[PDB]
Design a protein around this ligand. Sequence first.
Ligand SMILES: Cc1cn([C@H]2C[C@H](O)[C@@H](COP(=O)(O)OP(=O)(O)OP(=O)(O)O)O2)c(=O)[nH]c1=O
Ligand SMILES: [Mg+2]
Lengths: 419, 218, 1005
Amino acid sequence: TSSADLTNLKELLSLYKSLRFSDSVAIEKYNSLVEWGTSTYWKIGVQKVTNVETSISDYYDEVKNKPFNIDPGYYIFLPVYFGSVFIYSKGKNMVELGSGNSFQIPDEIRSACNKVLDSDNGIDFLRFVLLNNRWIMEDAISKYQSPVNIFKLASEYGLNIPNYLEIEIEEDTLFDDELYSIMERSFDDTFPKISISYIKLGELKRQVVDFFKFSFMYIESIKVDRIGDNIFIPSVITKSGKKILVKDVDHLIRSKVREHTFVKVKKKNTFSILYDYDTRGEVIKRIIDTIGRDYYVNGKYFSKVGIAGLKQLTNKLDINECATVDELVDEINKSGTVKRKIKNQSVFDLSRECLGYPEADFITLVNNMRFKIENCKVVNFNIENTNCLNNPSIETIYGNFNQFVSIFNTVTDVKKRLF
Amino acid sequence: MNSVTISHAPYTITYHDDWEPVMSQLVEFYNEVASWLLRDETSPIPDKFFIQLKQPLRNKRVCVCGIDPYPKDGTGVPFESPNFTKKSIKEIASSISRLTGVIDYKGYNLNIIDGVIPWNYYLSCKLGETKSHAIYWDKISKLLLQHITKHVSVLYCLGKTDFSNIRAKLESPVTTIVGYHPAARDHQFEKDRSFEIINVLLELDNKTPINWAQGFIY
Amino acid sequence: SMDVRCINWFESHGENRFLYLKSRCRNGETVFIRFPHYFYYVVTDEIYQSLSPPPFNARPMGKMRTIDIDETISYNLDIKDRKCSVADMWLIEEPKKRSIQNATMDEFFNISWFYISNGISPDGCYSLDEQYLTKINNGCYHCDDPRNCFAKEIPRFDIPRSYLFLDIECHFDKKFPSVFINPISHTSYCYIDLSGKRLLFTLINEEMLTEQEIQEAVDRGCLRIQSLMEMDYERELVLCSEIVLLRIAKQLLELTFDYVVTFNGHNFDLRYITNRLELLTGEKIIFRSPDKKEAVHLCIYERNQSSHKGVCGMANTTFHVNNNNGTIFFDLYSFIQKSEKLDSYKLDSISKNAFSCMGKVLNRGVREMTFIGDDTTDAKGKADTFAKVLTTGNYVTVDEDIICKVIRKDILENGFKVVLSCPTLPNDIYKLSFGKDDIDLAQMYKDYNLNIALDMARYCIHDACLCQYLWEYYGVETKTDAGAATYVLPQSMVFEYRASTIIKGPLLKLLLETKTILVRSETKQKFPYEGGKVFAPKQKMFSNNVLIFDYNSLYPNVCIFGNLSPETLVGVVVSTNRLEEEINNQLLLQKYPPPRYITVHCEPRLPNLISEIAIFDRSIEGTIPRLLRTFLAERARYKKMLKQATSSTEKAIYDSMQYTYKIVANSVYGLMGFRNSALYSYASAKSCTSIGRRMILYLESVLNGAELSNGMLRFANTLSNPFYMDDRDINPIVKTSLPIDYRFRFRSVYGDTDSVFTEIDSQDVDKSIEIAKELERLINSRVLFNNFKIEFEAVYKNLIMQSKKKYTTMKYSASSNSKSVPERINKGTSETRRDVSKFHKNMIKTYKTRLSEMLSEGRMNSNQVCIDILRSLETDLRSEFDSRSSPLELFMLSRMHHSNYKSADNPNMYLVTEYNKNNPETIELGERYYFAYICPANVPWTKKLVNIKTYETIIDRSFKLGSNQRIFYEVYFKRLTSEIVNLLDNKVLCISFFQRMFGSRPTFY
DNA sequence: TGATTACGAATTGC
DNA sequence: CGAATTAAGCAATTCGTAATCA
Ligand SMILES: Cc1cn([C@H]2C[C@H](O)[C@@H](COP(=O)(O)OP(=O)(O)OP(=O)(O)O)O2)c(=O)[nH]c1=O
Ligand SMILES: [Mg+2]
């Protein structure tokens, strides 16, 4: 009845319009306002909803799987990359498509995304693809602009974009394999491409094409490949040496790849990609046994269980490398924000993040143990229940708990003086 | 259109097909109160008591409701002043003009806007005696307002004190909004923003908003 | 004025607002005092200096302290100290409402501020000084300085009071009466003036009698009047027209009575009188203020209450009178509904439940029996009340089923002697009660006559006097005075509000005395939390004495012991893993020593967490502990007052008062656990529950397996404080004063929150009571600590356990001996539930008795008991189905009407709505009603029941079963047999029988 | 057409 | 003729109907 009620109703309607583009926080706020409205006005046309499957398909069409025809207007061509797809919303987090969660992103991507959102009101969402720890902004939709200005803006803020092609067409051509090959070459890039997204000036709906064919080839070995510090990527090579690309560890788990067997793969002009939709306990240990015992599944990658030590602490804080404990306090005072980061977090979180353990698995392992702690330091530990050791990740982590306790005691006794 | 005959005045009630399942009980309830009701001069004239029974109910979305007709010069349709003399219609027209933007208007009428049905809770009143026929009308008002509620989507009440227990008076829940009376002290009705809220509520339930600028008379 | 005793306080709703006081002097003169009324706000000195328009008046309040009572979770032990500010406060008064952006203490009423700031008690006796009073009218005075007028208080003295009780009876032909078609036939009054005179008179409408009948009535003793001015109140029967009747009623309701008491008069009686007066004539009932500047008409308004459970929903309705002259209009219907619980709330049911007595047969023969009652039959006082009610009564119910007509009545000095018209009864002592009358009002109205008019006159005068009888029985005056004293509320507002309002007076007084303000700055979040601990029973049938031990005010005493207040909580410490849990435990045990701080472990708040510790401070006493101390002191006072009582009425009144104070003390906890309350504290509630669980576990552990040998007693485990180490001895070997040759074993069987059921291997009750008393003294002196004490409740014989909250037993009180009559106690069984049946209870009672007798005898060859019980049940059910001699009154169930349902389909609400649609009498939003299951007569026994709720029908007072309808016996029979089967031990035979009759699968424990 | 589980409502004991 | 300060907690059983499964 008052102005505050009108603003609440408008903001609830705004949230209702974009509900597939949501996460935990938006759903919680929407539910709270629905409760307030149904309490105040005794009935409201919308109800409380709790599952919420994130989808984008209302802005897309059915993929073209064979040659087709085009004719009118100017067209803008964009590439489609390989890897997990994410969508950034207004004041929200990265949310995984289909299984909406809140992925964690560094700081620079966060700042860039926040400022490009702050550039103007009319961004429905931003599309991102993660490919071997390489963020790539792929596309952005709006009812006012075209994905050109925002592309340049993102470039000048520091997050990479693909090169966008503006072209014109008059006559009646059948968009075919040869034209697709030429236009794909016209991108002049080495990252994997799977499809093309093209628009007509003004139309909201965006349609994509995909020319491919089936193939069968043998699987010769599953081996890891370094893509960073402590982060490994899966890979399978062929008899001819071809490289079958795999998005994620989850892709192998759900695709049930087998050593020394035959699988079905869709191959394209350059590369090939393994196909999904073929239990879990057998595979999750078979892969680790094949590659090597000293590997543990860190989220969507493979990590090492190495000896680690003093300098593995240093690289995370982004400080000058040191081999002396006394140096670990010297420049922290000189550093403006490193000490703030130290004080804001806790010892357990930083100690876990320094050796890169998974969150849930390590928490379960800790909750399945017993400790003897003296002077806020760990001196002894043991296992109480051995059922949790069935998971290969848990046993690999238990393999080097000594390094964890060493770095834990170091961080504790340096926090005793850093604050 | 169908008509039924009652024992007392006006001896003829004409109703639309949307008011079918209520007419029999309305006649039965009216037969026992007409004799005492008509002992006194009432506004409006008894011939104008049931003239909103003609309006269809399957094409309405919003209902604006008062507690009584005008004590003097009752026309028959709620919230009407052909000469533009009543204070309530003045303030309502002022609010609608402020919301829309039209400056020069000769008159306002709520019975012309599509999807809006003006209503009076009590259908009669003594001349110069506000709320003097409540006991006679109670059951009829209950029944008719309950029937209207089943068809509309948003129900808007004018008067905080008059409709303090509107939820107890109805069985099935409906979107109820209660606002200050137009003649409220302290000029409270000026700061009310119930019309935009109404439009937001209907657009929240996949219902077309209401054009309040349509009711102006030039 | 000088000496005055307060009666009522009320407000004025005119152009200018005022507060009124009604008081009476020693001689009997009535004095009114009028007070200006303000709007009270509490502001800081800075805000007071920054008020752009100067306030009307401001009074300093001194240095005070403000605490933020918001609760935040903490993952480490660097807990920030609570935000606490000290500043000078002011109290500003405004004639009109004002908005202040930074105003605090906004949860209290204006009348509470008036009382507490001016130092005035609502029910005190004062010695006013006229220097501060100005006379404006005969009987009214004006006071501008209430603080100096009410400065002197005097001892309480007695004053005379005036009352009016009335009841009416309206004509009807086929249904509930209608104001537009049906007239009033009778109207009765009970009139008490300030001199103490009691007058009874009934007015008969002559407009529905023939002239010859009128002449006969006048010749028989009645008085005929034609005008209002020619009536005398000193005559019982007066016959006149309807207009004169309404004018007399209007004249009587316009006086300045202290109380006008009715039964459901705010919905039917006064409404009917007002509407009929406005229909026949144009007159209205006018109430005027003591200063005669505001005049209002009678118009009954409705106050609707909503439920605080899910989807809110309306769950009660109440009707009130809008008078502004000081008279209190009291409806006993609402008071009885809100006070105590029955199956129905009609006048007949309340009279039957309240006015009963046992009677001895004195004479027999023909169709009459003479009964005698005295102090040697039932108790001290019951016979007196029965004789008091019998002065106007007409029909007496004998043995709960037979309705009898009174022929002659004799009132002895101490008891009563009544003769009734009933068949011969072959016993010596029977039960008498005042209940239903076997008269048909509709038939008597169809053929009206002079004798019928006189009979209805008697019935109406009895109905009018029942109001006074119930008024004296329920002790409304004492409760009103005590509530006005304690809650700091006007006398007319005591029985209107729940716990959230009646505690604001003491809370405000306590805050002002302590100089504390509580504020919030965040949003309150709600989480589930656990409750008390209930033990599973070990056996069903015991055959040994069971000792009952209970805690005295467990939760308030826990709050006092732990200092659990939202403003004394140091913090909540949580950990998500076993490592930080250990580190935080080690550091917490030494940062917060255990003689001052108390730490309580709790169930984790969220699934991710695994630990939760709440630390409380005990250096400064909190607010909730002092509220609880006040309420406990009041309960103790009324408990000793009950202990000193002699008559039944005083005992009942005092027991009810102490029960209400207990309930309020527990409601303090309930509010402290309520989300939408201003005293919300999640941690405090969880801590109180956890400490209660610790206490029950401690008592059960120390009592289980506790033998006594020679003159010495042994406890099972070491007796140590389960929170921190104390200075008391922890030796489980304790002196006893009992004789040496006693040897017994003790065992724990059942428990529920503040209770431990202890079993003793004995059979007599004198030794059991002596041992229980000694054990209670020992536990109080050695086992318990601080402010924890137990009480020996009773000794239970023949205890039977059905479920976790269902048992039956015979009770011997603490003050009892072997040669005493046992009392039957039922808790949760299918005899105290209001929605089971009336025919079910008789069958289960007789079958439990038969089972107990048969088990006492004992054959049980292979399955003898089960076979015999099944055969008897089958025969009884078949006989009941074939004969159909059981009345419909035995198959009636009760349910409450409310609008608080999830989803609007809800067959129950639809049934009630349809009944309201198709009948004149309406079921309101807090009204209990009767219903039963009815099916067509041609339908034969049904094996599979597909729908049940479709056969529910509402049984009105005028319901008569049709010739094409029958009671749907199958539901009742299924429920009764399912309940009976559970008591037996065999399964296969029960399954086979239940399948044979109903074809379904029985459920067991 | 059985079997089983889950949910809401009503009432009682703390 | 105009207006207009409410609200205790959880544990336990019994019954019918809707929803899901051999
Ligand atoms: C009766 C009742 C109890 N309770 C709670 C608080 C009590 O500590 C607990 C145990 O119930 P009771 O046994 O009634 O508690 P009590 O200790 O107050 O009894 P008494 O002083 O007569 O011996 O249940 C409520 O919350 N509300 C209630 O209405
Ligand atoms: Mg107790």
